[PDB]
Design a protein around this nucleic acid. Structure first.
Ligand SMILES: [Co+2]
Ligand SMILES: [Co+2]
Ligand SMILES: [Co+2]
Ligand SMILES: [Co+2]
Ligand SMILES: [Co+2]
Ligand SMILES: [Co+2]
Ligand SMILES: [Co+2]
Ligand SMILES: [Co+2]
Lengths: 91, 227, 138, 91, 138, 227
DNA sequence: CGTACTTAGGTTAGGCTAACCTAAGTACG
DNA sequence: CGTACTTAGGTTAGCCTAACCTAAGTACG
């Protein structure tokens, strides 16, 4: 089940990467939870957080704190639940 | 099969009043083993026909007509029970279920003939008073304030008491009624109610021919006079 | 009104056989004061449930199960009539209408008690034989 | 089934006896059809047409013609459907 | 609103597993905006029908049949998303909500036609893998 | 499963109008295979919500809102059918049943995108006109007075005719739709309708690839232009 | 002391059969 | 040419499950 347990073991959650000291990573998956908010999905498109776009995740400390990410067309803040629901591969 | 849905809803509300229970639709669903939606729709149909009203606190209130009809059914029920026990000789545990069908088909004409035959009876074979005898055109009403529920006697510290009433609720289980008869928890028999603490605990009772356990809802429906 | 539609259709067919009348649906419509469509629909429902069959000449034929149930109802009816006359003392003319309702609610358990109480009666108060006493075990 | 086909073959219908030229007969059965009319059952009792009473049946001709019968306490007219539904043994 | 309650409960449990979240009834209440009593009653109904079981630690465990049905719904969802983006050209942000309704009405017959049309896609437009393509015969 | 009971009742009334049938509750009962009581109760619920009214002659009349909603559903249905045939390539006989579910879930947003994708289509793959395109924000309306029902053409002495419309009623039977496709009774094909006498007799038709029999209710739902 | 869940008593929508009706037909000596 | 029955389209009463709700509980780190 590539969908539940990724075949690409190197796939990591945005929050997990951020809490592990940020990094440059390629957006891979955006879970159905994130998709539920359109206004957010409009934002995610606008700043260039879409599958197959390289992004920079800002290092963060403390759970229940929003995660900053920089895309090609600018940056934005993710909620912990949201950042948990976005997977990437670090480069 | 209920035979008459309306009459059984009315008598079930009457039963709940006699047991000192708040007559909710939830109670009818349990008792008659019908779905919530069924009961609400049937009660709405009876409300429309002016036999009851649903209060704000949602308890069912019989109208003048509703109470008159409920009494009529209950009267037929307990006269039938008297006939079945005293004359026909049907077994004590089978009588209620029979009488629960007969209550729907008996005319006032027959009721008046049964009153004469049975010598103007005032109580059922299970000790429950026969109402609406005035409406048949037939006595001093027993002061029954001294009667206490077996569950409440048990929670208040138990003691010895005389069995006076077994409510309709209890009569629905023939196997239980057979158990009650054997050990001797019947109207006009002395029993020892064992003390219990807290609500919804099964009450232990000791009859003349041994003892048995009553569920909280069963013990609530058996009424006694404490010695 | 009828209390049990099925039982009353069965007993009405039984009545017609006792009277030596051809049991047609038209007869049931008259007797029970119901419309032709109602009777045909109810008879079709009883045919489907295997209580009777509509013959070629269109007379209603009770099945083994149908006859067994019809006898059961009639037995209850005439035992009720006996009780109402001999014991309860209901007026001779009112007894049938009472017994016509009681026939639908009486258990075999009560029937067996009434047989003992009434001293193994073989006829109703109107002289009509009580059938299916064999099936009670008396 | 004594009720449908009588064991006592001598049991005959009031109308059949009447059309066969009347006769003195003992009331045996009153079918459930007859019982349906109380006012009639009151009349039948009153004039002494009840099981275990001898009656005289007036000879009649033509069906759809009401049958005259004489009981102990007087007489009365039966409808064909009524007379058909009363069984008797001729003396 | 949900179109199919059962399918949406199954897919919501599947969503939570993909997100690495513990699938509790509390999570379904939040996600589908339904009361706690509603969710417990609906989960009990799905447990009775053998689509899941409530564990000791009270996390929802899909049965063989439950998982098979959940996959079926998710597969339909992501194939619908592919069609809506690549072919129909519905706006990127509106696609999921559309696909969340379409997942309940799509036959396997159409799924197989979409597989051919979209050139055997393995992921949704949001990069989420399409499961149960084996069960289509792709 | 209907998916949406209300929308299917509305579209069934619309279907009956297109087939020139009197929209009675009896028609909905047979079409959607539901009991008389069910249909009356559901129609009463739609009447209460102001989507239709029951006339004195008992025929169902859609309100302004009812017709608007019925058109909306039918529009979604025939756009779905177009998409399924022209783009997805689902088999001709399976398309209706698929579209009958899809009609309940499709947004106007998608409808507008399908209009562009399918090049502003005006008819379904079965020749039925697509209504309510004005409401979407999209043509000269075909004079369809020249169209005649296969049953009426057959009773009037038969003849050669071009197949124009196969109504939704006919589409419900996939096995039949497969038979029609094989022999070649499809929109834009010429057929020879054999003459019959008396109503409610099965009509014989001769397509390009052989012939077949249509039931009176099926023949009534197929519309043709006689040469 | 919130987080998760149960207990208790509702609700509407959407299905069903049994059992009654009328009005206007057909089938048959 | 009535007698018996069918066709067609209703009706109310009396049942059901699925799927939503609130208010006020219990159970547990
Ligand atoms: Co009782
Ligand atoms: Co009762
Ligand atoms: Co009688
Ligand atoms: Co009767
Ligand atoms: Co999605
Ligand atoms: Co969905
Ligand atoms: Co279609
Ligand atoms: Co549909």
């Amino acid at each position: 089940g590539d969908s539940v347990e990724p075949v690409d073991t190197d796939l990591r959650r945005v929050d997990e990467v951020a809490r592990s000291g940020g990094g440059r990573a390629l957006v891979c998956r955006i879970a159905e939870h994130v998709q539920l908010d359109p206004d957010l999905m409009s934002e995610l498109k606008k700043v260039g957080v879409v599958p197959g776009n390289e992004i920079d995740i800002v290092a963060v400390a403390g759970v229940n704190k929003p995660i900053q990410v920089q895309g090609s067309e600018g940056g934005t803040q993710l909620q912990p639940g949201i950042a948990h629901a976005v997977m990437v591969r670090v480069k | 099969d209920l035979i008459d849905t309306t009459e059984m809803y009315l008598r079930t509300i009457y039963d709940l009043e006699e047991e000192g229970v708040v007559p909710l639709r939830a109670r009818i669903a349990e008792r008659l083993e019908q779905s919530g939606p069924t009961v609400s729709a049937t009660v709405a149909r009876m409300e429309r026909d002016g036999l009851l009203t649903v209060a704000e606190d949602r308890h069912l209130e019989l109208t003048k007509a509703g109470r008159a009809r409920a009494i009529s059914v209950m009267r037929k029920h307990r006269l039938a029970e008297r006939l079945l026990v005293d004359v026909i000789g049907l077994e004590w545990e089978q009588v209620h279920l029979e009488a629960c069908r007969w209550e729907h088909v008996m005319s006032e004409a027959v009721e008046r003939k049964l009153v004469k035959l049975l010598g103007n009876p005032t109580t059922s074979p299970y000790g429950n008073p026969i109402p609406g005898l005035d409406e048949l055109g037939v006595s001093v009403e027993p002061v029954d304030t001294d009667l206490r529920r077996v569950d409440e006697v048990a929670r208040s510290g138990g003691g010895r008491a005389l069995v006076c009433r077994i409510a309709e609720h209890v009569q629905l289980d023939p196997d239980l009624m057979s158990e009650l008869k054997k050990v001797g928890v019947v109207p006009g028999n002395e029993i020892d109610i064992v003390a219990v603490a807290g609500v919804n605990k099964p009450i232990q009772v000791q009859g003349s021919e041994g003892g048995t356990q009553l569920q909280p809802g069963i013990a609530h429906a058996v009424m006694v006079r404490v010695k | 009104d009828l209390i049990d539609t099925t039982e009353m259709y069965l007993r009405t067919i039984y009545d017609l056989e006792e009277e030596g009348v051809v049991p047609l649906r038209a007869r049931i419509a008259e007797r029970l004061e119901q419309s032709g469509p109602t009777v045909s629909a109810t008879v079709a429902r009883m045919e489907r449930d295997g209580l009777l069959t509509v013959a070629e000449d269109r007379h209603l034929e009770l099945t083994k199960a149908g006859r067994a149930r019809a006898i059961s109802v009639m037995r209850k009816h005439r035992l009720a009539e006996r009780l109402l006359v001999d014991v309860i003392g209901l007026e001779w003319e009112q007894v049938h209408l009472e017994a016509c309702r009681w026939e639908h609610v009486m258990s075999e358990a009560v029937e067996r008690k009434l047989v003992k109480l009434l001293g193994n009666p073989t006829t109703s108060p109107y002289g009509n034989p009580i059938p299916g006493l064999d099936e009670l075990g008396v």
